[PDB]
C-alpha cells in the first residue's frame, strides 16, 4: 500500500507534463520529511508512457500488455497518449514508443517496441522489461 | 514465400552482396596500407575534421551502411584489443579471399569445400609461421633493434619526417619503464600529454613527470637544482577564526586588523615550512627546495615562499600528487605540525615553462621515477591527434616486441614466402583430397594481396616487383641457403628486410591470418539473408 | 477477411514451405550459416536452428503455429528442433499437388498421413538397434557424442559419468503387469537442477540422491547431524497471532506491554508442543519463526528452518515424504516425513549444505557441481543439461537408430513398398510421405557439397538392395556405413520428430480458411 493506480490512464496533450511530471512525488507516510522540505527522501513513481498509433501492430499488442500489467502492478503508473498528440510531427518510423519516467526524470527511451522482445510480444517480454 | 516488412536474399544473391561489400571495404582500406599509403579525411558535421590513417580508428569512427561491411569491421577490430595492429591487413586478406572464393564458386565450387581448403591452408600457414620466425635475444644492448622496430612502426603512420623525432622518444620511453629484467611491462607508466601553439617537430621525451600548474609569483626561481620535493595536503589559504566570528565594523580598518590577526594561523604553518626548508640543505651548495602544496595558497604565503627562494605550486590534481609520490619519492603531509625531513623527496632540475595560455612545471630527472612522460606538441588539432596516435602505436609495437621475442622480417617477405610454401607443400601433399585444391589455391593467391597493395601504393608495378622477388627466392632456394627477400618501396627492387631494418610482430601476423580466415569462412558460409523485427 | 476454395490451402502450404526452406540448411555438421538482419544496423551470423526459428518473424498464422511447435519441441525433446519443421514442410509440399491437381479431399490425406505415421513408427522400431542401458561404459560412450567437441571437452570424462549418475538417480526402471511401465518418469527440469558450488574441480562433483538445502541452522545451539531424521513441513508462522478481524492493542502501564510477549510465548509454546507431538527432528516453516519458537523447538530436540521457499518444500515432500499442513493445530502424526536419510551439513567449498538424500527412488535428486570459476560452472551446467536430455532420450528406449539419414531413407523405402500393395486412393499420400522422408539425406548431401542426385540415387539403391545402415558421411560426404563410422541418433528423437511433423501437417491441412474474429 498505497494501491495507487490499478489501470492505464488516457492523457491529453495539455496534461502530459502534469501526469508524467507527477512522477516526482511520494505520499504521506511513504518516506521521511524534513525542515522546510516536505518531499520524501525516497524516489517517486515509475511511469510508463505509451505513445501509440492505433493503425500499427505493436501499438495494438501493447495496449493489451499495458493494461494487463496495470491490473497486477497496482503501484506502477501506466498512461497512453496518441503519439500524434504528444510530439509535433511524431514520425511513424519511431512508432510505438515507450518512455519510462521516475522521480520526474527519464529512465528508458525504447523506440519501435516491436523489437523489445518478440514481434508477438508476450507478458513475459513486458514483465522482463518492467523488472529492469 | 515471403512476409511483409521483410527482405531476403535467395539463391547466390547473399554471396554476391557479401563479396561486393567486402570488396568495397577493401578498396576503402586498400589505399592506406604501408608507409606509402594515403590518409583519410573524416568530418563529424560539427566542424571537427580528423585526418587519420590507422585502420582501427578509421573503422571505429566511420559509419558503415552495408551489414556485411559492419560485420567485417567489427571482426577486424578485435586486432586492436589483442595485438594493436593489423586491421588493414585483416580487411585486405578477407577481401581477397572472398574475391577468390567467389571466382571459384562461379565455376561451381561449393562454399564448404572452399572453407575446408581455407582451414587446411590456415594450418599450413601456422606451421610456416612457426618455422619462419626469428628468435630475438635478451641482450640489454638491443637498443638498435628497438630503434629499428620503432622506425618501422612510425613510418606507416607519419610523413617520414617526424620519424627521426618519434623513434628515439618511443624507444627510450618503452625501455625506461621495462628494465632489462623479467618483471613486467605496463604502458600505463608512460604518460601522454598534448600542447598547443607549438611546432609538430618540437615533440620531446621527458624522463619524469610534468605538472600542469605552475608558479604564481615573479620572484620564484625559474630553475631549481637538486630540489627537495615537499607534498602538503594542508591548505595555505587565508584562514578565519576557528570558532564563530564575523566582520562587523564601521570602517575597513577594523576588518583589515581582524584579517591580519586571523592570518596568524597560516603564518604559523609557513614558519614551520620555512624552518624545514632551512634545516634540510638550507644553505648547502647545489641544493634547492620545491613544495607541491596540493591545496591552494594565499598570495601572501606565495610571496613568503618566493622571498625564501622556494618554488611553490598550488591547486594540483590528486592524480598528480599520487604520481609524484613515486616519481619524486616524497610523501604527502596531512598535518604541518608533524612535518619532518623524512617527508621530503628528491628530484633533479625543476623548470617552469611559460606559455601564452598556461604555465607548466617540470619535475623530471628523478633517481627512480618508475615512469616517464611524452609531450606531444603541435599547432593544429589534427596534427596533435596524428602524433598521439603514432606515439601510442609505436609504444604498443615496441611493448609487443619486448614481451614477445618472436620477430618476423617484414617488407612483404613473409606473405610471399608463405604463399610459395603453401603452393608447394599443399599441392605436394594433398592430405584431404583434390577438391580442396581450389580453396588452397584461393588462399595462397589471397595471401599475396598485401605485397601487391604495398607496391601499388608505392607507385611501382606490382607485377615486376613480385617477379623480381620470386626470382631472388628461386635463386636462394637453388643455392640451398636461407635468405629473406622483401620489397623496397623506395627503390622498387627486392631487398633483405633483416638488413634494411623492417620487421613485423609474430602475434600481429598470427592474429591477422586467423581473423581473416575466420571472417572469410563465416561470410562464405552465408546461404541467405533474413530480415526480422520490423 | 475470408478465403474460400483451394486458395486457403495453397496459402497455408506456401507459408509452411517458406518456413521450412529457411532452416533446410540447418542439418548436419556442415550446416551453412545464416544472416539475421534487424531493422537497426545490428546483425548476427548465428547458425543455430533454434536461434534462426526464434528471431525470424512470420506473418502467416500457419508459420506462427509451426514456429510454436518447434519451440515447444525444443523443450519437450532434446533434439529435433529443425528436423520437425523440415519434415512437416516437405510432407506438405509433397501432398500439395494431390490437394490442388488431383482434387483429393483433405480428409483422405489426413487419414493417409496418420496411417503413414503408424507405418513410419513401425519401421523405425524395426530398424533400431539395442543398447546396453545397464553397462556404464556403453552409456558413457553414447553420451560422449553430445559432450565432446564443446567447451566441456576438457572434463567430458567426468561430465559423462555425472550426467549418467544423475539420470539413473532420477530414472526408475520398473516393469510389471500391475502398474504398467512407468516409462522411467524422468523429469530433468524440476528435480535435477544443478547446484553451482564455487571451487573444486569437475571430478569432485557428486550426485545427491535427494534434495540439497542451502538454509543453515537458524540458531548456533542446534543439532547439525541426525542419524534418524524426520521432516515436518508447516506454513503458519510460530509467533504472536492476531484476530481474523481488526485487532487493537491497548496498554495503560508501560510495564504491561509484556502482556503481548506473554501471549506470544503461550501461543508459540502450544504450537511447538503440537509440532513436537509427531516426534519430529527438523521443523521447516515457510513463514517467519520467532526466537521463542526456535527455543521451544530446540527444547524438544529438533532443528528449525524458517522462511523456506515453497520450491524447497515441493522437492522435500518428494524425497522425504513429509506432508505440509497450513495450520499447526491441524498437524497429524501421519504427516511426519519418516524414511529420511540424514541431516548432514558438511560444508564444501566454503558453502553451507544440508543433505536430505536416501537409498530410495523418489524420482528426484540434486547435482552438486564444482568448478574453478563461475563461467566454468555455468557452461558445465548448460552442457550437463544437454547431456542429461540426451541420456534421458537414450534410456527412455534402450535402442538407437542409424544417423546420417539412413533411418529416413529406410523408412521411405519401406513406406513405398507397403504403399505399392495398398490398392487404394490413399496410396498417393503414402508415396508423398515416403518421398518427403528423403529431405534429410538431401540436406546432408547438399551441405556436404556432393551430387544431390547421384549420391541420393546410390543411397536409395543401397538401401533397397543392401542394408539400412548406410548413410551420408559428415566429412567425406560419401555413402558409408553408419555403424562402422559410429554415426547414430536416439530412436526416441526420430519417433518424436516423425510423429510431431506428421501431426502438424495434418493439423495444418485441416484448416481450410482464416477469418477475422475477436
Curated annotation (Swiss-Prot), chain A:
Further remarks about this protein from its record: Present with 7700 molecules/cell in log phase SD medium.
Region of the whole protein represented: 92 to 223 of 286
Family as reported in the entry's similarity comment: Belongs to the phosducin family.
Signal sequence range: none
Organism of derivation: Saccharomyces cerevisiae (strain ATCC 204508 / S288c) (Baker's yeast)
Reported consequences of knocking out the gene: Impaired growth, cytoskeletal disruptions caused by actin polarization defects, and abberent nuclear segregation caused by misoriented mitotic spindles. Cells are enlarged or do not bud, caused by cell cycle arrest in G1/S phase.
Subunit structure, as described in the record: Interacts with the G protein beta-gamma subunit complex (STE4-STE18 complex). Interacts with CCT2; this interaction leads to inhibition of CCT complex mediated actin folding.
Function, as annotated: Essential for cell growth. Inhibits early G-protein signaling events following pheromone stimulation. Inhibits the folding activity of the chaperonin-containing T-complex (CCT) CCT2 which leads to inhibition of cytoskeletal actin folding. Plays a role in cell cycle progression in G1/S phase.
Stretches the record annotates as Thioredoxin fold: 5-132
Disulphide linkage map: none
Listed name of the protein: Phosducin-like protein 2
Localization terms from the record: Cytoplasm
Curated annotation (Swiss-Prot), chain B:
Task of the protein: Molecular chaperone; assists the folding of proteins upon ATP hydrolysis. Known to play a role, in vitro, in the folding of actin and tubulin. In yeast may play a role in mitotic spindle formation.
Keyword Metal-binding: no
Keyword Ligase: no
Gene Ontology molecular function terms on file: ATP binding; ATP hydrolysis activity; ATP-dependent protein folding chaperone; unfolded protein binding
Lineage: Eukaryota, Fungi, Dikarya, Ascomycota, Saccharomycotina
Location within or outside the cell: Cytoplasm
GO biological process: chaperone mediated protein folding independent of cofactor; protein folding
Name of protein: T-complex protein 1 subunit zeta
Residues that bear Phosphoserine: 245
Family: Belongs to the TCP-1 chaperonin family.
Gene3D superfamilies assigned: GroEL, GroEL-like equatorial domain, TCP-1-like chaperonin intermediate domain
Keywords recorded for this protein, A-Z: Acetylation, ATP-binding, Chaperone, Cytoplasm, Nucleotide-binding, Phosphoprotein
Cross-referenced InterPro entries: Chap_CCT_zeta, Chaperone_TCP-1, Chaperonin_TCP-1_CS, Cpn60/GroEL/TCP-1, GroEL-like_apical_dom_sf, GROEL-like_equatorial_sf, TCP-1-like_intermed_sf
Subunit structure: Heterooligomeric complex of about 850 to 900 kDa that forms two stacked rings, 12 to 16 nm in diameter.
PROSITE patterns per UniProt: TCP1_1, TCP1_2, TCP1_3
Swiss-Prot record, chain C:
Residues that bear Phosphoserine: 245
Presence of keyword Coiled coil: no
Superkingdom of origin: Eukaryota
Record's keyword terms, sorted: Acetylation, ATP-binding, Chaperone, Cytoplasm, Disulfide bond, Nucleotide-binding, Phosphoprotein
Molecular function GO terms recorded: ATP binding; ATP hydrolysis activity; ATP-dependent protein folding chaperone; unfolded protein binding
Keyword Phosphoprotein carried by entry: yes
Cysteines paired by S-S bonds: 359-365
Location in or out of the cell: Cytoplasm
GO CC, any one term: chaperonin-containing T-complex
Any single Pfam family the record assigns to this protein: Cpn60_TCP1
One BP annotation, GO: chaperone mediated protein folding independent of cofactor
Cited InterPro entries: Chap_CCT_gamma (IPR012719), Chaperone_TCP-1 (IPR017998), Chaperonin_TCP-1_CS (IPR002194), Cpn60/GroEL/TCP-1 (IPR002423), GroEL-like_apical_dom_sf (IPR027409), GROEL-like_equatorial_sf (IPR027413), TCP-1-like_intermed_sf (IPR027410), TCP-1_chaperonin (IPR053374)
Subunit structure: Heterooligomeric complex of about 850 to 900 kDa that forms two stacked rings, 12 to 16 nm in diameter.
Protein family (similarity comment): Belongs to the TCP-1 chaperonin family.
Physiological role: Molecular chaperone; assists the folding of proteins upon ATP hydrolysis. Known to play a role, in vitro, in the folding of actin and tubulin. In yeast may play a role in mitotic spindle formation.
Name of the molecule in the record: T-complex protein 1 subunit gamma
Organism: Saccharomyces cerevisiae (strain ATCC 204508 / S288c)
Taxonomic lineage from the root: Eukaryota, Fungi, Dikarya, Ascomycota, Saccharomycotina
Record gene name: CCT3
